[PDB]
């Protein structure tokens, strides 16, 4: 299917408690493969998936150098943001960065991404053209002007269309046993009376990869979106994900309800009911 690579940076100031912490993580699809943490005893880019371990010392040294340089850059950007927002040096603030590429089954670029946030709010983003910017406020417009003058978008475009896609293709081949394997959900429906009048039907999906899934309840063939409780998809810790969806139903009406499951690992969507 289609695939993505993403890097995520978080830079967090902590006045009075040293310099800002910088943490970076890299993902292919829903699989983390690298991390860097400036608070580690010996900071380095480190492997977090088996298929990246085969990269040689030049790779790891280059990634570590880049993360250390990025940490220094984002410590400076935290100071700059204080100025742009007229903020005191006493508070703690956070910059977040995301970037990466999406490719189709043919490995061709579908689109690239690069977005920035300050204190959890959009700051600036590279547009889909990989050539212009959208700034969220008058502070980010200062950054935009600086980045237009320095033709920063051209450097992002060159990475996103070049090295980003080329490395993603390499990782997908080296990790094909896992990155190119979808694990379908294991599904079942549970029933719990709430009172003499009503019961909960809960439709479960366990053990699936990747995380994207759709679980829906229908009553008499009509989706019950407003009456369904849907938990956030959650990691099991073994690469796979879990999710459930529940509805409260009148006792004796249970067979009017069907749970529908869509997942990339299923050749056809599943329909399930409570089996008493």
């Amino acid at each position: 299917g289609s695939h993505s690579m993403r890097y995520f940076y978080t830079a967090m100031s902590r006045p009075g408690r040293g310099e800002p912490r910088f943490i970076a993580v890299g993902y292919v699809d829903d699989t983390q493969f690298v991390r860097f943490d400036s608070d580690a005893a010996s900071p380095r880019m480190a492997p977090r998936a088996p298929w990246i371990e085969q990269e040689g010392p030049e790779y790891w040294d280059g990634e570590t150098r880049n993360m250390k340089a990025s940490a220094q850059t984002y410590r400076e950007n935290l100071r700059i943001a204080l100025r742009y927002y007229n903020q005191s040096e006493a508070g703690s603030h956070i910059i977040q960065v995301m970037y990466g590429c999406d490719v189709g089954p043919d490995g061709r670029l579908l689109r690239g991404h690069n977005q920035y946030a300050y204190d959890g709010k959009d700051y600036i983003a590279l547009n889909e053209d990989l050539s212009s910017w959208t700034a969220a406020d008058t502070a980010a417009q200062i950054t935009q002007r600086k980045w237009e003058a320095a033709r920063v978008a051209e450097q992002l475009r060159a990475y996103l269309e070049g090295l980003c896609v080329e490395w993603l293709r390499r990782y997908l081949e080296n990790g094909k046993e896992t990155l190119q394997r979808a694990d379908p959900p294991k599904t079942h429906v549970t029933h719990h009376p709430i009172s003499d009048h009503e019961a909960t039907l809960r439709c479960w999906a366990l053990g699936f990869y990747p995380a994207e899934i759709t679980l829906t309840w229908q009553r008499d063939g009509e989706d019950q979106t407003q009456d369904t409780e849907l938990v956030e998809t959650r990691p099991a810790g073994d690469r796979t994900f879990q999710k459930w969806a529940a509805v409260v139903v009148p006792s004796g009406e249970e067979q009017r309800y069907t749970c529908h499951v869509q997942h990339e690992g299923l050749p056809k969507p599943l329909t399930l009911r409570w089996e008493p």
Binding site: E76, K146, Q155
Partner: peptide, 10 residues
């Protein structure tokens, strides 16, 4: 591999 973007500040 990560993006190398030298000498770019906010």
């Amino acid at each position: 591999a990560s993006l190398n973007l030298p000498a770019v500040s906010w």
